[PDB]
């Protein structure tokens, strides 16, 4: 109802108004982001799945998930802060010889609330698009970071994955995940395994 | 020796409205509206 007193939420003519604070729910031989999302990823939004000699498991990237949380929280906070809908407290009454002022009051009350309903709905849908593109760009910038780290030591299988020409242990898998990776150390073994393949 | 770049998915059925797409199922969402 528009007439509210006290510390109150702003009034819109909306049935549903939900902000995306996550990725698209696309469930699913564990392959990367081209095939879909990982159900077994739980400790974050973005991350890695390694398979090597010692073991296999999912490892979330906490830094990119934290920066994504940092923008999504500011998006919801700016949605709350930028709305300046003024509260109606009483509702005005008019007699039989004040129909022109009654219609003007109804025009103002049915114009401002329509404008702010449009503004709130438009801001929610536009930043829903921006969130759903921001998450795709954040996965792609992670893939590009691992590609730029790995270079010619890795064979892409398509499907958001890399096969190392050389042999890596948990400490190497953990090194691509961390930002430190030694490209010239495994360069000769990558050359030997690339010449054989 | 494989590593992969993937993302989060779960059993959530939260549907949102995008401009060009309707009823997009998302992993996490917030409600802004009290009804």
């Amino acid at each position, epitope marked *: 109802h528009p007439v509210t007193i006290g510390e109150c939420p702003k009034y819109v003519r909306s049935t549903k108004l939900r902000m995306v*604070t*996550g990725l698209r729910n696309i469930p699913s031989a564990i392959a990367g982001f081209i095939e879909g999302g990982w159900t*077994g990823m*739980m*400790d*974050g*939004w973005y991350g890695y799945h390694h398979q090597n000699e010692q073991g296999s*498991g*999912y*490892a*979330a990237d*906490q830094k990119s*998930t*934290q920066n994504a*949380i940092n923008c*999504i*929280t500011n998006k*919801v*906070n700016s949605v709350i802060e930028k709305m300046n809908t003024q509260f109606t407290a009483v509702g005005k009454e008019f007699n039989k010889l004040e129909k022109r002022m009654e219609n003007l009051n109804k025009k103002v009350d049915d114009g401002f609330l329509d404008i702010w309903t449009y503004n709130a709905e438009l801001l929610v849908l536009l930043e829903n698009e921006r969130t759903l593109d921001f998450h795709d760009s954040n996965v792609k910038n992670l893939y590009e970071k691992v590609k730029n780290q790995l270079r010619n030591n890795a064979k892409e299988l398509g499907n958001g994955c890399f096969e190392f020409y050389h042999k890596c242990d948990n400490e190497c898998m953990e090194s691509v995940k961390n930002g430190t990776y030694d490209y010239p150390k495994y360069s000769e073994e990558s050359k030997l395994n690339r010449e054989k393949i | 020796d494989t590593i992969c770049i993937g993302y989060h998915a779960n059993n959530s059925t939260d549907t949102v409205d995008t401009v060009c797409e309707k009823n997009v199922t998302v992993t*996490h969402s*917030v409600n802004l509206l009290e009804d």
Partner: antibody
Amino acid sequence: QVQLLESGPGLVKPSQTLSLTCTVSGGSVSRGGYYWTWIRQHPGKGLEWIAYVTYSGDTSYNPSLRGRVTISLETSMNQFSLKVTSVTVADTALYFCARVPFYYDTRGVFYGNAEGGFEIWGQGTMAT
Amino acid sequence: DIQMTQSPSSLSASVGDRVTITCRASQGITNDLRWYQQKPGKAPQCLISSASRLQSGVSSRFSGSGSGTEFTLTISSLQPEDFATYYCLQHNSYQWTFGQGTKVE
């Protein structure tokens, strides 16, 4: 209203097994994005970290306590436990269980609730 | 083993004074420091997470800053309920080390 409640023996002999458990009430322990952590404090001394466990399965321990202690996540009973072997004089300490979240989230854009992003602690149990 | 050196280990101030607690790192801790506060007969609570960001339920008097090896925790005005031992915990590595603890008095 997630609360972490601890049950301990309170009296263990030297060279025995200290079975400590921390029961999570008001929430699920089977939620990802948290470190289910065990912190001990010697009497009249400082805080010492012992181990953590996640719902994924990641597990880490202190370098002074790699082989002695173990930490487990009981998903069905909604608790996590710490078992200490070969209890000595230095093992007598005030033990705290904690839920350290992965991310700073005051809104619940990941956690889903505003109270998911909170670091909650057990009140503490004493072992001698 | 990333070791935490926290200074000054004994501190004394009156009501209304401003102090600064500094915790130093052996290796490089990139915004992965948690600031703790246990009042006697009470479980510890987190004040500052990610070395600069205030937790919920924590007043705006506490502040954190620093990156890499050096970090600072500044209390703007000491109240009588700010009588506690203050700890710094790193979680950059998978082996977490607490500080020795600074007890204000």
